[PDB]
Symmetry: C4
């Protein structure tokens, strides 16, 4: 039913990568959280994603997506995640402005 | 079949919150309404949402969404609602530009 | 499988209405058409929609959508249509920037 | 599960055509690729699409979509493709700003 949508994280290897993540996950009780990030910590997600991408050049666009996806899935409360990694292209004519892989995972 | 899409309500606690609501609901007869808001009163929805958010600081982003969602669902003509609350982020590098919870409800 | 997406028709009653239409419909043979509009005539659709909206003030936002929808459905080749009528709001704080009804029809 | 989203290829016959393609297709092993384009070569896709559109004027908007779609489908690793060809309209009042055909194919 409920999801969290994280848009427009700009991370560098530099060549820009723009990342979006959707996380399907039950919202914690109001009684138990002092922020959204207590249900789902998109703060540590954004650091981890910045490290993954900044790391030893071994940085394939789908590899970033798959690692982000699995990282999110480590947390057994996530029913499913959808991770988009966009490499915005230098604007040269007859090419795509934007190329993105979108990775999905879910358990059920 | 038919829905009403309400985009871009900016409400303050201040920190901006941008809210969208979709409402699935049968449209009233042309014979009986003098405006859209007679099918679904997005005018009172926008006040109520501005009060909820402006209120005694106790304002969690998911709490706003859940309350909006339940408020809309009070009206038994609504088959389902989808409420997005967006907290547009101060633009600091390696963070998400936008973080949003999206709440869904439906009866059937 | 195949659809035609018509975005951003601005029509006046004046207060602006912005209309989008999607039409699900089998594409005609290359052998038989000299334009897209020979499969689906979005030219006459845009006139008709401009007349409907410009007409004797009796112009409800859902009424426009329903009439557009039925008009498109008159053509028995259409499997389904989705018509969005948007009334972009004067920007006053704590209100929705945009309010839209979206109408769907399909036969099967 | 996994898809590749290619947005905003501007191609000329001139009248601009803006093309998007989504490709559903299993991502190759990290072990075997040095780029995304090794899973799916959107580089040759963008040339081919620019040739198709630039070619002997015989250029219907749905014909471009269908040819792109079939071309992508030639590669038996693609589970499905969705090709949008947009002809952005000269902005004349009471007409659609944008008219697009969207073609889908899939095997299963």
């Amino acid at each position: 039913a409920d999801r969290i949508e994280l848009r427009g994280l700009t991370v560098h290897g530099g060549q820009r990568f723009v990342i979006d993540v959707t996380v399907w996950i039950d919202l914690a009780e109001a009684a138990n959280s002092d922020d959204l990030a207590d249900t789902y910590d998109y703060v540590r997600l954004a650091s981890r994603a910045a490290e993954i991408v900044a790391g030893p050049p071994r940085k394939l666009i789908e590899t970033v997506g798959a690692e982000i996806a699995d990282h999110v899935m480590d947390d057994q409360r996530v029913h499913a995640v959808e991770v988009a990694v966009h490499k915005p292209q230098a604007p040269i004519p007859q090419t795509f402005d934007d190329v993105a892989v979108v990775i999905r995972r879910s358990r059920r």
